[PDB]
Write a protein that binds this DNA or RNA. Structure first.
Ligand SMILES: O=c1ccn([C@@H]2O[C@H](COP(=O)(O)OP(=O)(O)O)[C@@H](O)[C@H]2O)c(=O)[nH]1
Ligand SMILES: [Cl-]
Ligand SMILES: [Mn+2]
Ligand SMILES: [Mn+2]
Ligand SMILES: [Mn+2]
Length: 535
RNA sequence: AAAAUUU
RNA sequence: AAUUU
C-alpha cells in the first residue's frame, strides 16, 4: 500500500560544498599509493540513493509479531520516565549542531541565550496545541569516505539524512531523551547491544556460544532499514513509549511528534525547495537509534519464533543483529533461516544479503566487525574484535584543506589495538609521522600519543602487546586490503616498525615506553613487558 | 541529523 | 575527537 517516498524532482543539494582530495597527500602518501580509490560520497549521488530506497511496502503481521509486541509492553510499563527541562535538553545539543532556520545556532542553545530559549518555548507550545500539522524537515546527503569496490559497482551512493529544525530537535529531547536512557534496556535486557563495550560484546558472544550443546550462529541486516519502517511501525513505536509512566505532558508531546514528524512529512532541500514527502523513518530524529533497535528487535524475535529458532540468544544494535541458537542440524538450520528471512520480509524488514547459518564464531560479521582469535604471551587463546581494514585505511588517506586524518589513525589505533593491522600498519605510520613532525607531546582529540600504552592496557589488557599467530582469515584479509589500496605489504611494515621502535627508544621517557610496549612484536628478542602503573 | 560506545 | 548503526 504505502510508498516510502515521493519526489517533486527537485535536486538534493549540498549543505555547504564538499571538498576534493588534492594532487599531493603528504600525511598519507607513504601509507598507501592508490588515492584514486579513496572517495567521499557526494550529494550528486543522492538522486541514485533515492531511486534505490523509494518502494512500496506491504507489512503483514501474525500471532508471533502480536505476541512479542505484547510482552514488550509488559516490559515497558516497568519504566517511569520524566520530562527534561527545556534547559537540560538544550544542554544535550552537540556543539556543532546545524543552526536553526530562525536565526540562532548551537552556541546560543547551549549557552541558553534568551532568544533561543523563547523560540524553543514557542515550538513546544505549538506541539502541545497542534497534534497534526506536518512538521517540515530538511533532507541532505551524508558525506562519508570509502574505498571504491568495482565488485559492488564502484561508488556507493550517499545515504539520506532527514531532520527537523534545531528548535524541534531540542523539544524531541525534552519529551523523549529520558525514555531513550531507560526503555531499550528495559524491553530487551541483555540483548540490548549498545549497552556493552567491545570487550563485553566479545565475552557475551563467547558465553552465548559456550552455553549451547551444539551452537549455530548467524547475523541479519535490513536493506535500507530506515525506508522499510512503516507508518504503522512508528505508531507502534509510539504505543511502546506510552506504555511507560509519563507526565501527561510528555504523552501529548510524544503523540504530537509521532503524528507530525515521525510518521512522515515534507522534505526540503538545502536551498528551500520542496523535495519530496516521506512515509518512513527519518534518520535524524532523536528516536532513530532507539526506534530502529526496538522495532528491529520486535520483528526479529517474532521471526525467530516463526522460524523455530531454538534457544535464541540475541544481540541487537539498530538494524544489526546476531542470533546464537541450538543447531537443529544443518539441513533444518538452513530451512529455518529461509523461514526467518521470509517472516522478516513479511514484516517489512527485508535483508541485504540473505543470511546463512554458521558454526564458527569468526565467520559471523555484524556492525561491520567480527570476533577473531590469536595466541597470547603465555600461549592461551585470546578472542578480540576486528574488521576489514579497507575502510579505515581509506579514511586514513582522506586529506583535504578542511580535514586531517590523524585523528582517525588514533581512533582506530585505540579501538582496534589488538588487531594485526593496527599494530603493524596504523601504529607504525602514526608514530613515524609524529616523530618526524616532532609532535608526540601534541594532544589529538584530547588524547596523548604517549599515554597509549596505558590507554590500550586499560582497555584491552596487557595481552594486546604480546599477541601472535593471527588467524588465516585475518592475515588473508589484511594482506588483501593493503594490496587493494596500494600500501606496502606487511614485511615492509615489520622494517618500518623496527626503525620507529629504535628511534622511539633512543628518545627515552614515555616515548621509549611506547617504543618498547607498542612495538615488541617487531623485535627478534622480545621483552618482559609488565603492568603499567597508570592503568 | 540523531544515538550509543570509546576517550 | 574516534568508531559504529
Ligand atoms: O549514519 C547513519 C547510518 C545508519 N543510520 C540508521 O541505521 C539504519 C541501518 O543502517 P545500515 O548501516 O544497515 O544502512 P541501511 O540499512 O539504511 O542501508 C539506517 O537505515 C539509518 O536509519 C543512521 O541514522 N545514520
Ligand atoms: Cl596467554
Ligand atoms: Mn541495514
Ligand atoms: Mn498517541
Ligand atoms: Mn546495518
Amino acid at each position: 500500500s504505502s510508498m516510502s517516498y515521493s519526489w517533486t524532482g527537485a535536486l538534493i543539494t549540498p549543505c555547504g560544498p564538499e571538498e576534493e582530495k588534492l594532487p599531493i597527500n603528504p600525511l598519507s602518501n607513504s601509507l598507501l599509493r592508490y588515492h584514486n580509490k579513496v572517495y567521499c560520497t557526494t550529494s550528486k549521488s543522492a538522486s541514485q540513493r533515492a531511486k534505490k530506497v523509494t518502494f512500496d511496502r506491504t507489512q503483514v503481521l501474525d500471532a508471533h509479531y502480536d505476541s512479542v509486541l505484547k510482552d514488550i509492553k509488559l516490559a515497558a510499563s516497568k519504566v517511569s520516565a520524566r520530562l527534561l527541562t527545556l534547559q537540560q535538553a538544550c544542554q544535550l545539543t552537540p556543539p556543532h549542531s546545524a543552526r536553526s532556520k530562525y536565526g540562532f545556532g548551537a552556541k546560543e542553545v547551549r549557552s541558553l541565550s534568551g532568544r533561543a530559549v523563547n523560540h524553543i518555548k514557542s515550538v513546544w507550545k505549538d506541539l502541545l496545541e497542534d497534534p497534526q500539522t506536518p512538521i517540515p524537515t530538511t533532507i541532505m546527503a551524508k558525506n562519508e569516505v570509502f574505498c571504491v569496490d568495482p565488485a559492488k559497482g564502484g561508488k556507493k551512493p550517499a545515504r539520506l539524512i532527514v531532520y527537523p529544525d534545531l528548535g524541534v530537535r531540542v523539544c524531541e529531547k525534552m519529551a523523549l531523551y529520558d525514555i531513550t536512557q531507560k526503555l531499550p534496556q528495559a524491553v530487551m535486557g541483555a540483548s540490548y547491544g549498545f549497552q556493552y563495550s567491545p570487550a563485553q560484546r566479545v565475552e557475551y558472544l563467547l558465553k552465548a556460544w559456550a552455553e549451547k550443546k551444539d551452537p549455530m550462529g548467524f547475523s541479519y541486516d535490513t536493506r535500507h532499514f530506515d525506508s522499510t519502517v512503516t507508518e504503522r511501525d512508528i505508531r507502534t513505536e509510539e504505543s511502546i513509549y506510552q506504555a511507560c509512566s509519563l507526565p501527561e505532558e510528555a504523552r501529548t508531546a510524544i503523540h504530537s511528534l509521532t503524528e507530525r514528524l515521525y510518521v512522515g512529512g515534507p522534505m526540503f532541500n538545502s536551498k528551500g525547495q520542496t523535495c519530496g514527502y516521506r512515509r518512513c523513518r527519518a534518520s535524524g530524529v532523536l528516536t532513530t537509534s532507539m526506534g530502529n533497535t526496538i522495532t528491529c528487535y520486535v520483528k526479529a524475535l517474532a521471526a525467530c519464533k516463526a522460524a523455530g529458532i531454538v534457544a535464541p540468544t540475541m544481540l541487537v544494535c539498530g538494524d544489526d543483529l546476531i542470533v546464537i541458537s541450538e543447531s537443529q542440524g544443518t539441513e533444518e538450520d538452513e530451512r529455518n533461516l529461509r523461514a526467518f528471512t521470509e517472516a522478516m520480509t513479511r514484516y517489512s524488514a527485508p535483508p541485504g544479503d540473505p543470511p546463512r547459518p554458521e558454526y564458527d564464531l569468526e565467520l559471523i560479521t555484524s556492525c561491520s566487525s567480527n570476533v577473531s582469535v590469536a595466541l597470547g604471551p603465555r600461549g592461551r587463546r585470546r578472542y578480540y574484535l576486528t574488521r576489514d581494514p579497507t575502510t579505515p585505511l581509506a579514511r586514513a588517506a582522506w586529506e583535504t584543506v578542511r580535514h586531517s586524518p590523524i585523528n582517525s589513525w588514533l581512533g582506530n589505533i585505540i579501538q582496534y589495538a589488538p588487531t594485526i593491522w593496527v599494530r603493524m600498519v596504523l601504529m607504525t605510520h602514526f608514530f613515524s609521522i609524529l616523530m618526524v613532525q616532532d609532535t608526540l607531546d601534541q594532544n589529538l582529540g584530547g588524547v596523548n600519543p604517549l599515554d597509549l600504552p596505558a590507554i590500550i592496557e586499560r582497555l584491552h589488557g596487557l595481552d594486546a602487546f604480546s599477541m601472535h599467530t593471527y588467524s588465516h582469515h585475518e592475515l588473508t584479509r589484511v594482506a588483501s586490503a593493503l594490496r587493494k589500496l596500494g600500501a606496502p605489504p606487511l614485511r615492509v611494515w615489520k622494517s618500518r616498525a623496527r626503525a620507529v621502535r629504535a628511534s622511539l627508544i633512543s628518545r627515552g621517557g614515555k616515548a621509549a615506553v611506547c617504543g618498547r610496549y607498542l612495538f615488541n612484536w617487531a623485535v627478534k628478542t622480545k621483552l618482559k613487558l609488565t603492568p603499567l602503573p597508570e592503568a
